[PDB]
Chain A
């Protein structure tokens, strides 16, 4: 019933706040900071590990401010939080790749408007 491509979600992920893999990243090492210190605490689960490594492997922005800026930039334009996160996580190159990856951007914007959007992403994309 739930369909990302058709932009369908169950009611719980309507007021949900999305993230970018780099947001999740920085928060997960934040929690590593909490865990490594504060002894007499349970070690983080292998699930926590798998997600940590993954988001680390694909966090396209390695600076907090840059992530914030990315976000903010995606906010000011009418976009769904879902597409917000998919664009920022996937970092597509050309407008047509975006459509292939995020069909829910079908007809929403113009390919050129979108293109300079993507370009704005990429230009904020931090070196690492």
Chain B
């Protein structure tokens, strides 16, 4: 899911940036630091909307830098267990379907794909299908799926999907 939350940070400002235009630098450093990263506590950090408060900048004794504590708000995308989201398959294997719920990558083991479907590598586009092909998931298809499990890897979240219950799968 996508959210909008408030967060915490302290930046060290080298003395070259003391001078006019220094609060902009505190901004630009908050930008360049927090954005683009992913953290398991909050999930994918899409972007920072609006900062709130630049604290009092304490010169650190010795060593010059000033430490400004900052308050800010940002968008984050955080999946949760038992959630259902749309996902797009990018590639199909005999093991399962690799999908993405946006920036995050999700996987649906063969076991989690219903029993009717079989994997057909022989297809001109590889796909999972029923024998009659009444339902066929392949590349680029949108699907719904329950996020049954999520895991952290190098601050990167990837989910575990399931197509078990009613109203999931091929959209």
Answer yes or no: A and B touching, Cβ < 8 Å.
yes
Most chain A Cβ neighbours within 10 Å, of B3, B4, B78: B3
Could you say which of B33-41, B57-65, B113-121 contacts chain A? B33-41
Inside 8 A of A3's CB, which chain B residues have their CB? 80-82
Enumerate chain A interface residues (CB-CB to B < 8 A). 2-6, 9, 12-13, 16-19, 21, 23-24, 27-28, 31, 42, 45, 47-48, 50-51, 54-55, 57-58, 82, 85-86, 89-90, 92, 96-97, 100-103
Known: A12-B41, A90-B86. 18 other contacts (CB 8 A): A3-B82, A4-B81, A4-B83, A9-B80, A13-B3, A16-B3, A16-B5, A18-B2, A21-B2, A24-B46, A31-B47, A47-B38, A47-B44, A51-B103, A54-B102, A57-B88, A85-B1, A101-B167
CB distance from A97 to the nearest CB of B (A): 5
CB distance from A75 to the nearest CB of B (A): 15
Q: Given A24-B75, A85-B1, is A5 in contact with B44 using a C-beta cutoff of 8 Å?
A: no
- State A2–B4 Cα separation when bound (angstroms): 18
Chain B positions 25 through 52: 1 when the CB is less than 8 Å from some CB of chain A, otherwise 0: 0000000100110100110101101000
Interface residues on B, range: 35 or more
Enumerate chain B interface residues (CB-CB to A < 8 A). 1-5, 32, 35-36, 38, 41-42, 44, 46-47, 49, 75, 77-78, 80-86, 88, 100-103, 142, 144, 146-147, 165-167
CB distance from B7 to the nearest CB of A (A): 10
List the 6 closest A-B pairs by CB distance, nearest first: A5-B82, A4-B83, A54-B102, A45-B36, A4-B80, A4-B82
CB distance from A3 to the nearest CB of B (A): 5
Q: Which of A47, A102, A103 has a CB less than 8 Å from the CB of B103?
A: A47
Q: Report yes or no: A24 in contact with B2, Cβ–Cβ below 8 A.
A: yes
Q: Which of B41, B86, B102, B142 has a CB less than 8 Å from the CB of A50?
A: B102
CB distance from B88 to the nearest CB of A (A): 7
Most chain A Cβ neighbours within 10 Å, of B41, B81, B84: B84
